[PDB]
Design an enzyme around this catalytic site. Sequence first.
Site, PDB file in Angstrom:
ATOM      1  N   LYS B  44      -2.932  56.387  35.454  1.00 39.01           N
ATOM      2  CA  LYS B  44      -4.076  55.589  35.709  1.00 39.01           C
ATOM      3  C   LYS B  44      -4.218  55.006  34.335  1.00 39.01           C
ATOM      4  CE  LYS B  44      -9.141  56.181  36.795  1.00 39.01           C
ATOM      5  NZ  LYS B  44      -9.912  57.193  37.824  1.00 39.01           N
ATOM      6  N   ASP B 138     -19.147  60.949  44.319  1.00 42.39           N
ATOM      7  CA  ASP B 138     -18.629  59.734  45.097  1.00 42.39           C
ATOM      8  C   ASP B 138     -17.498  60.160  45.811  1.00 42.39           C
ATOM      9  OD1 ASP B 138     -18.371  57.160  45.716  1.00 42.39           O
ATOM     10  OD2 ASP B 138     -17.104  56.552  44.118  1.00 42.39           O
ATOM     11  N   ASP B 156     -10.309  60.847  41.624  1.00 36.03           N
ATOM     12  CA  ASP B 156     -11.397  60.082  40.890  1.00 36.03           C
ATOM     13  C   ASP B 156     -12.421  60.588  40.420  1.00 36.03           C
ATOM     14  OD1 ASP B 156     -12.806  57.804  39.915  1.00 36.03           O
ATOM     15  OD2 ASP B 156     -12.040  56.485  41.487  1.00 36.03           O
TER      16      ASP B 156
HETATM   17  C1  LIG Z   1      -8.106  52.854  48.180  1.00 35.20           C
HETATM   18  N1  LIG Z   1      -6.750  53.307  48.189  1.00 35.20           N
HETATM   19  C2  LIG Z   1      -6.869  54.746  47.773  1.00 35.20           C
HETATM   20  C3  LIG Z   1      -5.208  55.480  47.970  1.00 35.20           C
HETATM   21  N2  LIG Z   1      -4.088  54.459  47.274  1.00 35.20           N
HETATM   22  C4  LIG Z   1      -2.884  54.750  46.910  1.00 35.20           C
HETATM   23  C5  LIG Z   1      -1.656  54.072  47.215  1.00 35.20           C
HETATM   24  C6  LIG Z   1      -0.632  54.621  46.970  1.00 35.20           C
HETATM   25  C7  LIG Z   1      -0.228  55.972  46.236  1.00 35.20           C
HETATM   26  O1  LIG Z   1       1.046  56.391  45.524  1.00 35.20           O
HETATM   27  C8  LIG Z   1       1.900  56.457  46.621  1.00 35.20           C
HETATM   28  F1  LIG Z   1       2.385  55.231  46.796  1.00 35.20           F
HETATM   29  F2  LIG Z   1       2.881  57.266  46.217  1.00 35.20           F
HETATM   30  F3  LIG Z   1       1.495  56.815  47.898  1.00 35.20           F
HETATM   31  C9  LIG Z   1      -1.401  56.587  45.843  1.00 35.20           C
HETATM   32  N3  LIG Z   1      -1.370  57.828  45.060  1.00 35.20           N
HETATM   33  C10 LIG Z   1      -2.078  58.387  44.002  1.00 35.20           C
HETATM   34  N4  LIG Z   1      -1.715  59.332  43.606  1.00 35.20           N
HETATM   35  C11 LIG Z   1      -2.633  60.079  42.688  1.00 35.20           C
HETATM   36  C12 LIG Z   1      -3.648  59.474  42.104  1.00 35.20           C
HETATM   37  C13 LIG Z   1      -3.925  58.327  42.467  1.00 35.20           C
HETATM   38  C14 LIG Z   1      -5.286  57.287  42.152  1.00 35.20           C
HETATM   39  C15 LIG Z   1      -6.118  58.020  41.607  1.00 35.20           C
HETATM   40  C16 LIG Z   1      -7.254  56.911  41.304  1.00 35.20           C
HETATM   41  C17 LIG Z   1      -8.377  56.887  40.640  1.00 35.20           C
HETATM   42  N5  LIG Z   1      -9.398  56.083  41.149  1.00 35.20           N
HETATM   43  O2  LIG Z   1      -8.532  57.796  39.879  1.00 35.20           O
HETATM   44  C18 LIG Z   1      -6.735  55.387  41.889  1.00 35.20           C
HETATM   45  N6  LIG Z   1      -5.447  55.898  42.556  1.00 35.20           N
HETATM   46  C19 LIG Z   1      -4.686  55.080  43.233  1.00 35.20           C
HETATM   47  N7  LIG Z   1      -3.266  57.754  43.516  1.00 35.20           N
HETATM   48  C20 LIG Z   1      -2.820  56.087  46.123  1.00 35.20           C
HETATM   49  C21 LIG Z   1      -4.482  53.014  47.424  1.00 35.20           C
HETATM   50  C22 LIG Z   1      -6.075  52.448  47.343  1.00 35.20           C
END
Ligand SMILES: CN1CCN(c2ccc(OC(F)(F)F)c(Nc3nccc(-c4cc(C(N)=O)cn4C)n3)c2)CC1
Lengths: 290, 290
Positions: B44, B138, B156
Amino acid sequence: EIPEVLVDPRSRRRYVRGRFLGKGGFAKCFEISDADTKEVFAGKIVPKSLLLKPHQREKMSMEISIHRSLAHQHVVGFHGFFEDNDFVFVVLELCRRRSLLELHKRRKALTEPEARYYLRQIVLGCQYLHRNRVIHRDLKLGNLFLNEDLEVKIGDFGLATKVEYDGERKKTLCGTPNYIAPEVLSKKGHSFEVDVWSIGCIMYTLLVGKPPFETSCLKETYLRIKKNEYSIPKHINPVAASLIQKMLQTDPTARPTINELLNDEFFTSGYIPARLPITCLTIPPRFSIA
Amino acid sequence: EIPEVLVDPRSRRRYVRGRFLGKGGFAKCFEISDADTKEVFAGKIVPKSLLLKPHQREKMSMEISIHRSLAHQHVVGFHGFFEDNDFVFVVLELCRRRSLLELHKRRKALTEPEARYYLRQIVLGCQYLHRNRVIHRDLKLGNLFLNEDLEVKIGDFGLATKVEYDGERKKTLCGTPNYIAPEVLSKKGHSFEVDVWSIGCIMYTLLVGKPPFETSCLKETYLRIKKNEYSIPKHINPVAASLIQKMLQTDPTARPTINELLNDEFFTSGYIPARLPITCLTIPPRFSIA
Ligand SMILES: CN1CCN(c2ccc(OC(F)(F)F)c(Nc3nccc(-c4cc(C(N)=O)cn4C)n3)c2)CC1
Ligand SMILES: CN1CCN(c2ccc(OC(F)(F)F)c(Nc3nccc(-c4cc(C(N)=O)cn4C)n3)c2)CC1
Ligand SMILES: [Zn+2]
Ligand SMILES: [Zn+2]
């Protein structure tokens, strides 16, 4: 990705796109010229790509609706609008000396006479809007534009609302004003008085050099506004200070009306220039007698 | 403008930047790998260019502070952080099946068993956070991440807050949640209960297929929340519907606590899969017996 040239089919007038000026929320604005009459305007240009939701398009068209109905020396002239379809174009009277925000950035606290001078025009402008049943709802320094003669012109009707029947109280305000009134927050409904509240904050800011409810956090400022937590510095004159207090009160029914304001001792018994030196963009005017 | 490679001076581990995943508010996240152990993580990545104000940097560091203190099967693993200085980098456990938001986009309303399955994990996760005196503030579908086994991982902590002494009521929440609780709005202060409220909305959304207070305007939704104005569709089972209602109540003292929840008839007397088919990303599971 905006057209260098801008044609209105309906009136056929064509415009050349000039230099960038700043933001509306969704909008970017530029100087533009009538290419035939070579007259210059401000163009507020909004991408239809941000207007995909019916709720956003209602706001956009509510703004045009309200703004084109308006004509006055202290309001930004509406000259028209048209669209292709990646953009809406609005044509506005160009204000050649930016806004009161840039003035404040450069001068910080103004002289009392300067404040009377600007505040009068803001108030005349607001009186016109209230006669026509319009509440602006976001009067702030960056909305108060200046023409070459340093006359104030209220603009950005992006949050303005029409009072449709007598006694109506608006329950929502879709957006986040700078100088936002108590009742808007403690959501019990609001009307014309919110603008007089804004004019109270503006007056504080012009005279003090910074806004009345400033903090490092917006949400903190909000709390502070709900509690009426501000203080006026002791070097501000009492007549001024008293008028500020009249406007910055939590109950809207206790604030002055807008037609009532210019009657305040603050205007009736102090000096009000007829015009300002252009030097006052950057130098405090001394207002000498000869 | 982010480095293709990412070095932690303090632990010297180095990371290769992989594919883009999505947003935190200020952040953009990518897959990244330990380059030596080749282990994969989510990075991140936040530009220090958005962190110029002390208030924004406190939030940023409050998030790290809270998040790195946490370790649990249903919370996103914190593996560490470092910065050069145009960026802060946080290294998180990678959740390989995105989040519950994408699941919902693709399946809309889930089967009751599926909802029990996810809601349990969300609740276990939240119980851990409340034992450690953390309110998330949230909880929503896009925050509820899924690993390869489709286990829920709360992530998050950008709006999370620590309860520092017993009985403390937080007066502000700097940001704008999706499923936001009444008391946060009618700003009389809030605590742990806001999360149980969120879990009520999530449960509604999982079962109904859309959120309980949807409108074309956020500010309208807010009003609707202050008035507790929602309705549960008649095809939802009563045990479920009753639990939703317990959580979606305006007075926080009347909602269940989080340790109290899994005791509800909704979980104790209904079927809860031990694991889900990967096919359920896109196909409703029938839960046949043989
Ligand atoms: C709204 N959606 C939430 C989840 N999303 C998403 C899409 C693909 C992903 O990795 C994969 F490809 F390996 F699966 C992941 N995988 C993933 N893994 C760990 C942490 C996070 C993450 C944390 C935060 C934050 N706001 O702190 C934002 N994101 C991203 N995302 C998340 C895409 C946007
Ligand atoms: C916050 N500041 C407010 C005033 N600003 C500014 C700077 C240069 C300008 O023209 C020039 F160069 F001729 F003087 C103008 N001149 C100008 N004139 C008429 C309308 C507008 C305008 C309306 C809106 C809106 N939100 O609807 C935004 N802008 C821009 N701006 C305004 C810059 C940003
Ligand atoms: Zn804040
Ligand atoms: Zn809205």
